[PDB]
Amino acid sequence: EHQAIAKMRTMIEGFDDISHGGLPIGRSTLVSGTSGTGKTLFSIQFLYNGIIEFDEPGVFVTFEETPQDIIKNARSFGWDLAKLVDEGKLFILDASPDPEGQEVVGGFDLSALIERINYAIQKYRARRVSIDSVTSVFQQYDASSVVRRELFRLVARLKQIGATTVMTTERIEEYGPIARYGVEEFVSDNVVILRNVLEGERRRRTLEILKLRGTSHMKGEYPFTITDHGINIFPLGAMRLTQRSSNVRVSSGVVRLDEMCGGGFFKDSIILATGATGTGKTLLVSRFVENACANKERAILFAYEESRAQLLRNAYSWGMDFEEMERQNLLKIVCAYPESAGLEDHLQIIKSEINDFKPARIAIDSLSALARGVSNNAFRQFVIGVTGYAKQEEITGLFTNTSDQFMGAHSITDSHIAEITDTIILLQYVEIRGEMSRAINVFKMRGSWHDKAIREFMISDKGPDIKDSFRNFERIISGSPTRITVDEKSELSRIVRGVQEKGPES
Amino acid sequence: PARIAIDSLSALARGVSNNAFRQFVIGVTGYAKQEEITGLFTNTSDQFMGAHSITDSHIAEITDTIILLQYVEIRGEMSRAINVFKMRGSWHDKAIREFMISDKGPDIKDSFRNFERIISGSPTRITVDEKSELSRIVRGVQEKGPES
Amino acid sequence: KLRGTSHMKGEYPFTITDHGINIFPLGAMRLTQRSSNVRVSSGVVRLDEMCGGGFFKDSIILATGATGTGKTLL
Amino acid sequence: RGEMSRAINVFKMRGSWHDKAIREFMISDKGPDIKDSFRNFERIISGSPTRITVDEKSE
Ligand SMILES: Nc1ncnc2c1ncn2[C@@H]1O[C@H](COP(=O)(O)OP(=O)(O)OP(=O)(O)O)[C@@H](O)[C@H]1O
Ligand SMILES: Nc1ncnc2c1ncn2[C@@H]1O[C@H](COP(=O)(O)OP(=O)(O)OP(=O)(O)O)[C@@H](O)[C@H]1O
Ligand SMILES: Nc1ncnc2c1ncn2[C@@H]1O[C@H](COP(=O)(O)OP(=O)(O)OP(=O)(O)O)[C@@H](O)[C@H]1O
Ligand SMILES: [Mg+2]
Ligand SMILES: [Mg+2]
Ligand SMILES: [Mg+2]
Ligand SMILES: [Mg+2]
Ligand SMILES: [Mg+2]
Ligand SMILES: [Mg+2]
C-alpha cells in the first residue's frame, strides 16, 4: 500500500475505508462531536476490536463515566468487557473526580496521569489507548492557553511511549468550532468529527475525517448508524463502479411483457416502474416477487405505502397467494413508513434484510415514497445507495416511482433518477372516449431490444392484460389523445352479419 | 365511530409546512386504518379545470381509493363530472361520468363519449359524422334486392 | 442520549392537555393495518357500482375536486 | 370576433341552484345587462373561444 504512514485497523464497519486503512500507529486521533454523537462508543469499539481481533491489550482512561458503567453499557452491543478486564486484555483507568471532592487538580495530576498511563501500558503491554472526555478536566477553571500546552504534553509523551491513542472531545455547536477551546484541533495528528445534524425534526449522524496528517483519506461527511452491533458507516462514495454484468434474463411475472423486453428482464439490472397514481406499478411489483417465488428463489418486498395485510389482500384478488409465499420461505415482505426514521437508517434496514435473507430479487415499492420531505441530494444519495448494493450482488431490483402529476407529466423521474436506472417501465392514463384506460410502455433497456409499442393494458382478477397499441391516435402521451383515422375498419376480421355465438353453443 | 370524515384537509394545509401536513395525514390516516374506521377525506384542488394533479402536497399515495370531481365546460355551461380514479382492491368504473345536483342529491348520468380532452375542463365536441362512417348513404351497392 | 441503550431519535410532537403530557410517536406506529374484503355503501348507489360494490371498510377514500364540484355533498 | 366582450357566472352557491351557463353581458349607463350564453362556442373559460360552426349533421 502506497501511503507513507503505517495505519492500524479499527475493524469498524466503514472507518478503515474512509480513513484509507485506519488510525496511524504511534499517533493520536481527536474524535470529537456534540452530545450523544457516538464518541465513547467509537473509542470503546476501538479498544475492543484491537482486543478481539489482534490480541492487542489496551488502556481505557475514563474521566466522567464510572469504570463500572463503561462495562455496564458496553453490554448493550454484546461486549463482556468485564471478561476482558479480567483476562487482563483491557485495563480501565479511573480518573473520574469524586462525589466528595475538594477543588484544584488538573496540572500536576496531568504530570501524574502520564506516569499513571505509562504504568498501565507498560504493565498490560498495551498498543491502543482511549482517553475519554479530556475536556471535563480543563472544565475546572482553564482557558485556551493552558489547554494547548497541557494536552500537548499528554499526546507527545503518549507518542514517545508509542501508543496509538484516541481522544474524545465535546463541542456545543454541530457545524461551528471542532472542539470547545478550539485548540485540540491543531495539537492532534488526526481529527475525526461526529455530528448529529437535525433537519426536519429527524436526526442524521455522520462521521468525517477533517485531517490525517501524512496520508490521504475520504473527504467530507459520511452517514453512520449505531446498532446493536456498534457504529456502522456507509462510504457511499467509496462504492466503486465495478459490479458484474450478465446477459442472463429473468421473468417479470407477465409474459407478454417479457416479450416487450427482448426476452425477459436482465438479472444484473435496475428496473424502474413509473406512472401516475393508480396505474398499477404496485401490481407489476407483486407479479415480480411472485414469479421469483414460483421459480424457487428468494426475494424481499419493502413496502412504504401499504400494509403487510392489505398488500396480501390486493395480491390475492390479483391471484397470486402471498400467504403461501411467506410460509414456503421464498418471499418476505418488510413494510414500513418512511417517516419512521431518516434515510441513513432505512438504507441499512434494507441491507440488513438482504443479508439475513440473501434474496436473488428485491422490490422497493415507491422510492418516490422515501423522497417525502427529504432534499433531492439526500434522496439521490440514498437511491444510489440501495441501487448500488443490489448492483454488485447479482440482485435484480424493481423500484417503483409514482409521478406527482397524472396525464401531462413531462418527466418520469421527478427526482431525476432516470440515469441510475438500467431499464424503465412506463404506466400511464389515456382518456379514451370519456374513459380512463391505462397503457404500458418499455421506454428503455440498456442491453436489450424491447418493444417500442405503447400497448394499452387492462386489469382483472387475473392480472395485467397486455392488449394492442393506439396506432390510430396522435398526442398519446398527452393524456387525452386525438382521433385521426386512415382506417380502423381495415380487415383484421371484417365479415359482417352474424359473427358471434353467445353462451349457449359455438 | 364506524366511519369518519374530514372536510378539507386542504383546509388544514393552510399556512402550515408541507412536511407537517404530510405528517398530520399519516397522523390521521394510520389511526383510521388500524381502528377499523372507514374514512373519507376532502381536498379542494387549488385550480378549477386543468388541474394536473389531484391533491396538492401529494397525499394521493397514502390513499386506497380516489373519487374525483371536475367541471366540464359544455355548450357555454359549467357542469360537473365524477370518476373513480383508482381503487386498490376493487374493480371500479373506468368511465368519466357527468352528474346533476338538485334536491335529491347526485345523479351520475353518462360519460361524454362523443368528446375529446375532457380531463382539461374544456373539451372538443367531436360528433361530425358519428360511428356510422361515410356510409350513411350506404353507397348504393344496395340497389340489388327489390325487383318487380 | 440514553447511554447504554437505544431509543427513538428525533423530535416528537406532544400535547399538554387535561390528562398530562401526551406524545405521538408518529414514526413508531407500525404498518400492520389489518384488512378485509368487506365493503360499505357511500350514500350514492350508482357510485357504489362504479367502485365495484362499495368502498372497503378498512380503507382511505379521497374525494378531490375543484372548488364547488361537490366534495362536501359527497 | 376581435373584441373584448364580458361574461358573468355564478361559479358556486352552497344552498341554492344557481345558473350553470356562462352568460355574456355588457355595461351601459343603465348598469349591467346580462345576455345569452355562447352556446355555440368552445374553450370559453380559457377566454379565447373557438366557434364550432358544426356543419349540422351534414344533412
Ligand atoms: N444498542 C444500541 N443501539 C442503538 N443505539 C445505541 C445503542 N447503545 C447506545 N446507543 C446510542 O449511543 C449513544 C451513546 O453515546 P456515547 O455514550 O457512546 O458517547 P457520546 O454521546 O459520544 O458522549 P457523552 O459521554 O457526552 O454522552 C446514545 O445516543 C444512544 O442512543
Ligand atoms: N381486482 C381488481 N380487478 C380489476 N382491477 C383492479 C383490481 N385491483 C386493482 N385494480 C386496478 O389497479 C389499480 C391499482 O393500482 P396498483 O395497486 O397496481 O398500484 P399503483 O397504481 O402503482 O400505485 P397506488 O395504487 O399506490 O397508487 C386500480 O386503480 C384499478 O383500476
Ligand atoms: N339545492 C341545491 N340544488 C342544486 N345545486 C346545489 C344545491 N346545493 C348545492 N348545490 C351545488 O353544489 C355545490 C356546493 O358544493 P359542496 O357544498 O358540495 O362542497 P364542495 O364543492 O366540496 O366545496 P365548496 O362548497 O367549498 O366549494 C355548489 O357549487 C352548487 O352548484
Ligand atoms: Mg454526549
Ligand atoms: Mg461518551
Ligand atoms: Mg402502491
Ligand atoms: Mg398510490
Ligand atoms: Mg370548496
Ligand atoms: Mg366545502
* CATH number of the domain encompassing residue A378: 3.40.50.300
Measured between CA atoms, the residue of chain D closest to residue C67 is D12
Please work out whether the CB of residue A366 comes within 6 Å of at least one atom of ligand 2.
no
CA distance A482 to A395: 42
Is A502 part of a structural domain of the chain? no
User: Cα(C9)–Cα(A225) distance, rounded to whole angstroms?
Assistant: 11
- Residue B61 half-sphere exposure toward CB, CA atoms < 13 A: 29
- Cα angle at A473 between A467 and A479, to 5 degrees? 85
Instruction: Note down the domain range covering A225.
Output: 1-236
State how far Cα A143 lies from the chain centre.
41
Of B76, B121, B122, the CB nearest to D39: B76
Ligand 2 and A460: CB distance under 6 A = yes
Mark the residues whose beta carbon lies below 5 A from ion ligand 8. B 44; C 67
Alpha-helix residue ranges (DSSP H) falling in B1-148: 9-12, 18-34
C-alpha of residue B30 to centroid of ligand 7, in Å? 15
Helix extents (H) in A356-442: 367-370, 376-391
Statement to judge: residues A14 and A139 lie in one domain: yes
Domain boundary among A211, A236, A261: A236
Question: Could you please report the per-residue DSSP string of A323-374?
Answer: HHHHHTTSEEE----GGGS-HHHHHHHHHHHHHSS--SEEEEE-HHHHTSSS
Closest CA to A442 of A269, A218, A202: A269
User: Which residues of C have a CB under 8 Å from any CB of D?
Assistant: 67-68, 72
Looking at beta carbons, which pairs linking C53-58 to residues 24 or more positions away fall under 8 Å?
A: C53/B90, C55/B38, C55/B40, C55/B65, C56/B38, C56/B64, C56/B65, C56/B89, C56/B90, C57/B36, C57/B38, C58/A310, C58/B33, C58/B36, C58/B38, C58/C33, C58/C34
The C-alpha cell of A282 is what?
404496485
All three cell numbers of B47, joined, read 385550480
Residue A404 near ligand 2, beta carbon < 6 Å: no
Domain co-membership, A228 together with A245: no
Question: Nearest C-alpha of chain C: how many angstroms from B132?
Answer: 29
Burial of A293 (C-beta count, 10 Å sphere; 0-12/13-18/19+): buried
What is d(CA B117, CA A479) in angstroms, rounded to the nearest whole number? 8
| Minimum Cα–Cα distance from C25: chain B residue | B27
In the numeric block, which cell numbers belong to residue A141? 477553571
**Cell numbers 440482485 label which residue?**
A395
Residue that is written with C-alpha cell 418471499 in the block: A331
- Burial zone of A64 (CB within 10 Å; 0-12 exposed, 13-18 middle, 19+ buried): middle
Q: List beta partners, residue B67.
A: B84, C63
Task: Give the Cα-Cα-Cα angle B79, B85, B91 (nearest 5 degrees).
Answer: 125
Alpha carbon distance B58, A339 (integer Å): 15
Domain-embedded: residue A495: no
Distance A53 CA to ligand 5 centre (A): 23
Per-residue HEC secondary structure of A242-295 comes to: CCCCCCCEECCCCHHHHHHCCCCEECCCEEEEEECCCCCHHHHHHHHHHHHHCC
Q: Are residues A27 and A81 in the same domain?
A: yes
Q: Give yes or no for a contact between A59 and A50, defined as CB atoms under 8 angstroms apart.
A: no
Contact criterion met (CB < 8 Å) for C65 and B44: yes
Beta carbons within 8 Å of B9's beta carbon, 6+ residues apart: B21, B24, B25, B28, B41, B42, B43, B59
Which element (helix H / strand E) includes A484?
none
* Separation of alpha carbons A78 and B119, rounded Å: 60
C64 annotated binding-site participant = no
C-alpha grid cell for residue D42? 368552445
Q: What is the identity of the amino acid at A300?
A: I
Q: Is the dihedral of CA A290, A291, A294, A295 positive or negative?
A: negative
> What are φ and ψ of residue A275, in 5° steps?
180, 155
> Closest partner residue to A277 among B61, B117, B120, by Cβ?
B61
Ligand 1 pocket mutation pick from A12, A32, A35, A39 by most atoms within 8 angstroms of CB: A39
Flag if D54 and B124 touch (Cβ within 8 Å): no
Residue indicated by cell numbers 481529527: A191
C63 neighbors B43 (Cβ within 8 angstroms): yes
Closest CA to A480 of B48, B54, B126, B128: B126
Residue whose C-alpha cell is 419512521: A340
- Cα diameter, chain A: 112
Q: Which residue in the block uniquely carries the three cell numbers 386542504?
A: B10
Q: Are A244 and A450 in contact (CB under 8 A)?
A: no
A145 and A243 share one domain: no
- SS3 assignment, position A166: strand
- Whether A30 maps to a domain, the answer reads yes
Q: Is D57 in the pocket of ligand 3 (CB under 6 A)?
A: no
Say if residue A479 is in the same domain as residue A344: yes
Rg value, chain A, Cα: 30
Q: Distance between terminal CA atoms of chain C?
A: 49
In a domain, A505, yes or no: no
**Residue type at C40 in one-letter notation:** V
User: In chain A, how many domains are there?
Assistant: 2
B136 vs B144: CA distance, rounded Å: 18
Helix, strand, coil distribution of chain D in percent, nearest 5: 0, 30, 70
Give backbone dihedrals phi and psi of D23, rounded to 5 degrees, phi first.
Answer: -90, 130
Neighboring chain A residues of B66 at a CB cutoff of 8 Å: 277-278
Chain B neighbors of D52, CB-CB under 8 A: 125
* D49: Cα within 13 Å, side-chain hemisphere: 22
Ligand 9 centroid from CA C72, angstroms: 5
**Type and span of the H or E element at A154:** helix A144-161
Beta bridge partners of A61: A93, A131
Q: Do D21 and B78 touch (CB under 8 A)?
A: yes
Euclidean distance between CA atoms A483 and A471, whole angstroms: 10
Distance of CA C25 to the CA centre of its chain: 15
Contact D20 B122 (CB under 8 A): no
With a 6 Å cutoff on the Cβ, whether A230 touches ligand 2 is no
- Residue type, position D20, single letter: K
Q: What is the largest CA-CA distance in chain B?
A: 86
CA-to-CA distance for A317 and A287, rounded, in angstroms?
12
- Cα gap A271→A289, rounded to integer Å: 13
| Distance from C-alpha of B43 to C-alpha of B12, rounded to nearest angstrom | 10
Residues A311 and A452 in one domain: yes
A161: nearest Cα among A130, A129, A193? A129
Residue A409 CA neighbour count, 13 Å, CB half: 23
What 3-state DSSP class applies to B30?
Answer: helix
Kindly report the number of other CB atoms within 10 A of residue A365's CB atom.
Answer: 26
Closest CA to A286 of C54, C59, B88, C29: B88
Kind of pairing between the strands at A164-170 and A128-132: parallel
Identify the CA nearest to A15 among candidates A192, A187, A174.
Answer: A192
Q: Looking at chain B, how many residues does it have?
A: 148
In A125-143, alpha helices (H): 135-138
Q: Compute the distance between CA of residue B90 and CA of residue A296 in angstroms, rounded to an integer.
A: 30
Nearest-by-CA chain D residue for B118: D43
Binning chain A into helix, strand and coil, the percentages to the nearest 5 are: 30, 25, 45
Strand (E) positions, B27-93? 38-44, 65-69, 72-74, 77-87
Chains that touch A (3 or more CB pairs under 8 A): B, C
Q: Are residues A131 and A208 in the same domain?
A: yes
Question: Among all ligands shown, which has an atom nearest to the Cα of D12?
Answer: 3
Q: Strand order in A464-466's β-sheet?
A: A428-432, A435-439, A456-459, A464-466
Q: Which set of grid coordinates corresponds to residue D19? A: 345558473
The three cell numbers locating residue A395: 440482485
| B12 Cβ neighbours under 8 A, 6+ residues apart | B21, B24
Q: Is the dihedral of CA A242, A248, A254, A258 positive or negative?
A: positive
Q: How far off is chain B from A348, nearest CA to CA, in Å?
A: 23
Nearest to A251 by CA among A293, A281, A282: A293
Give B104-111's long-range contacts (Cβ < 8 A, gap of 24+): B105/C43, B105/C44, B105/C73, B106/B82, B106/C44, B106/C47, B106/C70, B106/C73, B106/C74, B107/C46, B108/B82, B108/C44, B108/C46, B108/C47, B108/C50, B111/A433, B111/A434, B111/A435
All cell numbers assigned to D31: 348598469
Q: Which residues pair with A398 in a beta bridge?
A: A271, A363
If asked whether residues A349 and A441 sit together in one domain, one would say yes
CA distance A448 to B53: 34
**Planar angle of CA A263, A265, A268, nearest 5 degrees:** 130
d(CA A348, CA A329): 22
Which residue of C62, C71, C73, C74 to mutate against B (max B Cβ within 10 Å)? C62
**A258 plus A403 within the same structural domain:** yes
Could you tell me whether strands A482-483 and A473-474 are parallel, antiparallel, or unpaired per DSSP bridges? antiparallel
Question: What is the pairing mode between strands A164-170 and A28-33?
Answer: parallel
Could B73 and D9 be called an inter-chain contact, meaning their C-beta atoms sit closer than 8 Å?
no
Which grid cell sits at A82?
Answer: 468485564
Gap from C72 CA to chain D (nearest CA, Å): 10
User: b/e for B78-101, b at 16 or more Cβ within 10 A?
Assistant: bbbbbbbbbbbbbebbbbbbbbee
Query: Which among C33, C39, C73 has the least Cβ separation from residue B106?
Result: C73
Q: Which amino acid is residue A214, in one-letter code?
A: G
Signed CA dihedral, A249, A253, A255, A257: sign only = negative
Counting every residue, how long is chain A?
Answer: 506
Stated as kind and residue range, the H or E segment containing A438 is strand A435-439
Ligand 1 atom nearest residue C5's Cα: 8
Residue contact A277–B94, C-beta within 8 A:
no
Helices (H) and strands (E) in chain D, counts: 0, 4
Long-range contacts of D5-8 (CB under 8 A, 24+ apart): D7/D38, D7/D44, D8/D32, D8/D34
Q: Please, which residues have CB within 8 angstroms of residue A355's CB and are 6 or more apart in sequence? A: none
Instruction: Choose the mutation target among B86, B125, B131 for the interface with A, i.e. most A CBs under 10 Å.
Output: B86
Which grid coordinates are listed for A295?
A: 421459480
Residue A499 included in any domain: no
Retrieve residue A461's grid coordinates. Answer: 382478477
Q: Kind and range of the H or E element at A424? A: strand A423-426
Q: How far is the CA of C5 from the centre of ligand 2 (A)?
A: 43
Residue A448 annotated as part of some ligand binding site: yes
Backbone angles phi, psi at B121, to 5 degrees: 80, -35
Q: Chains near B, with 3+ CB pairs < 8 A?
A: A, C, D
A289 touches A420 (CB < 8 A):
no
Residue A38: burial class (beta carbons within 10 Å; 0-12, 13-18, 19+): buried
> Known binding site for ATP: residues of D?
6, 12-14, 16, 18, 20
Nearest-CB residue to B92 (from C50, C57, C72): C50
Resolution (Å units): 3.3
DSSP state, C26?
A: T
Q: Is residue A501 part of a domain?
A: no
- CB within 8 Å: D54 and B128: yes
* Residues in contact with A302: Cβ distance below 8 Å, sequence separation at least 6, in sequence order: A333, A334, A335, A336, A350, A353, A362, A363, A364, A365
- Asked if A245 and A268 count as a contact pair (C-beta separation under 8 A), the reply is yes
Write the CA distances from A216 to A45, A213, A279, B35, C33, integer angstroms: 23, 8, 50, 56, 50
Exposed, middle or buried, A126 (CB in 10 Å: 0-12/13-18/19+)? buried
Q: Give the atom of ligand 2 at the shortest distance from the alpha carbon of A284.
A: 18
Contacts of D37 in chain B (CB under 8 A): 75-77
Q: Read off φ and ψ for residue D42, nearest 5 degrees.
A: -130, 160
Beta partners for residue A458, in sequence order: A465
Domain match, A134 and A243 both = no
* In a shared domain, residues A206 and A284: no
Are chains D and A in contact at 3+ CB pairs closer than 8 Å?
no
Q: Under a CB-based contact definition with an 8 Å cutoff, are residues A334 and A352 in contact?
A: no
Is residue A405 in a domain?
Answer: yes
**Nearest-angstrom CA–CA distance, A178 and A31:** 10
Pairing state between β A164-170 and C60-65: unpaired
Residues A125 and A230 in one domain: yes
**Which of A236, A271, A299 is a domain's end point?**
A236
Of A161, A99, A127, A131, the residue nearest A32 (C-alpha): A131
Spatial distance between the Cα atoms of A111 and A140, rounded to a whole number of angstroms: 17
The region that residue A334 occupies, defined by phi over 0 for left and psi between -120 and 50 for alpha, beta otherwise, is alpha
Beta bridge partners of A226: A231
Q: A162: exposed, middle or buried (C-beta count within 10 Å: 0-12, 13-18, 19+)?
A: exposed
Rounded alpha-carbon distances, angstroms, from residue D24 to A339, C6, D50: 52, 69, 15
Give me the torsion for CA of B96, B102, B103, B106, rounded to 10°: 0
Residue A498, domain member (yes or no): no
Neighbouring residues of C35: CB distance < 8 A, sequence distance ≥ 6: A307, A309, A310, A312, A313, C56, C58
Query: In degrees, to the nearest 5, what angle opens at C-alpha A482 toward C-alphas A477 and A483?
Result: 125
Question: CA torsion, points B26, B27, B32, B38, in degrees to nearest 10?
Answer: -60
With cell 504504568, the residue in question is A119
